Design a protein around this nucleic acid. Structure first.
Ligand SMILES: [Mg+2]
Ligand SMILES: [Mg+2]
Length: 76
RNA sequence: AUAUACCGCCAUCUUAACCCUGAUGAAGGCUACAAAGUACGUUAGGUCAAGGUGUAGCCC
């Protein structure tokens, strides 16, 4: 949601550009066009910190796994 | 006599695209503590005095 409590324009624009979206949706949000919605609280700092931690950890772990797999492929 | 013959000189006037919204109707698009907006000719002109090339007139 933007600051007028309407959807972020990027949701519709990403749908137009065929870019998948992950999103945190609160009870007053519209999840119809988010590809992978995650229902949850987006206001409490604890919750937002948990989301940031999870996504950062997943991204770094995936990138490290890619590096390890390519290294194994070349070495072996 | 004619630049109301040209040339010279002066002067007069004339000389987009993309992206969104509305049911992809006519149509519309701003808020900063930010909400779709971003990129030459012309003249019955003057000048025959610091300049020219022609054309015509009269020639009891
Ligand atoms: Mg909320
Ligand atoms: Mg004249």
């Amino acid at each position: 949601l933007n600051n007028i409590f309407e959807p972020h324009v990027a949701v519709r624009d990403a749908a137009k550009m065929n870019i998948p979206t992950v999103g945190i949706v609160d009870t007053n949000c519209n999840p119809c066009l988010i590809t992978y919605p995650v229902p949850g609280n987006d206001d409490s700092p604890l919750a937002v910190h948990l989301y940031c931690r999870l996504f950062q950890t997943a991204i770094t772990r995936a990138k490290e796994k890619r590096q390890q797999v390519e290294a194994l492929y070349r070495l072996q």
